[PDB]
Amino acid sequence: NVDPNANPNVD
């Protein structure tokens, strides 16, 4: 569902 380059941290 996500872009692998998207924010991988808590948000």
Partner: antibody, heavy 123, light 107 residues
Framework: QVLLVESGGGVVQPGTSLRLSCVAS????????MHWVRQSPGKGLEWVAI????????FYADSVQGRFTVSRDNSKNTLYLQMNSLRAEDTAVYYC????????????????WGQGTTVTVSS | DIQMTQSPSTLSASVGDRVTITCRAS??????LAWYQQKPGKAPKLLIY???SLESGVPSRFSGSGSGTEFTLTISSLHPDDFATYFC????????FGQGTKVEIKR
């Protein structure tokens, strides 16, 4: 100060399994995505895997897809790389790296890497 | 599938020289470009993030520029600690690196 300590590398034969660890300190490990990156003379710098802060989303490089799995245990502050069906072309120094801090950006790289652990695959 | 290629592969220069390294992306990556420094036996170290932003502790003599497919790393005055290999990295579509540019001492 961010500190990443890889471990588990060694000299093994092809077709075997090996599991690398990366222990983190100096920052909130459970709130950051983490990367695995390897480097060899033949292939250069190769991104291997990424895992989301909570251990959910995982993405892998094509060259390791189906053979390597990435995981993490936030209670132990450790990042793992399970390698299976090792081949000689998997020989490299494997680094662990922390994703860049959260901002308004939609794309994210890495900032701090560990010292590296060497995996030698040979018959 | 985004290939990063640097030039030159080896650059010979003296202390105090102004040197420039170029990085080229096979397709557009906007400004999602990082510059790394590595000395033998040591892990790569991030110097520049998002094309032009120096990281904390990096001396002002380093700087980067570029957007799209053409990128440049520049050292205004070469310092004895700057002789190393430099890698570029795109972080828009997975993560891929250039092959490196060794900055070597010219005697």
């Amino acid at each position: 100060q961010v500190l990443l300590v890889e471990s588990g590398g060694g000299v093994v034969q092809p077709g075997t399994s090996l599991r690398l660890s990366c222990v983190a300190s100096g920052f909130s490990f459970s709130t950051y995505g983490m990367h695995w990156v390897r480097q060899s003379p033949g292939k250069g710098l190769e991104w291997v895997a990424i895992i989301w802060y909570d251990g959910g989303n995982k993405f892998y490089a094509d060259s390791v897809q189906g053979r390597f799995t990435v995981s993490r245990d936030n209670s132990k502050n450790t990042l793992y790389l399970q390698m299976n069906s090792l081949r000689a072309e998997d020989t490299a120094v494997y680094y662990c790296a922390k994703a860049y801090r959260t901002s308004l950006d939609k794309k994210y790289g890495m900032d701090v890497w560990g010292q590296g652990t060497t995996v030698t695959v040979s018959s | 599938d985004i290939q990063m290629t640097q030039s030159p592969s080896t650059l010979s220069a003296s202390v105090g020289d102004r040197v420039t390294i170029t990085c080229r992306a096979s397709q557009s990556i906007a400004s999602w470009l990082a510059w790394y420094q590595q000395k033998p036996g040591k892990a790569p170290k991030l110097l520049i993030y998002k094309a032009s932003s120096l990281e904390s502790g990096v001396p002002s003599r380093f700087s980067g520029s570029g957007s799209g497919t053409e990128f440049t790393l520049t050292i205004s005055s070469l310092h004895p600690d700057d002789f190393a290999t430099y890698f570029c990295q795109q972080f828009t579509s997975y993560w891929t690196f250039g092959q490196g540019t060794k900055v070597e001492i010219k005697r």
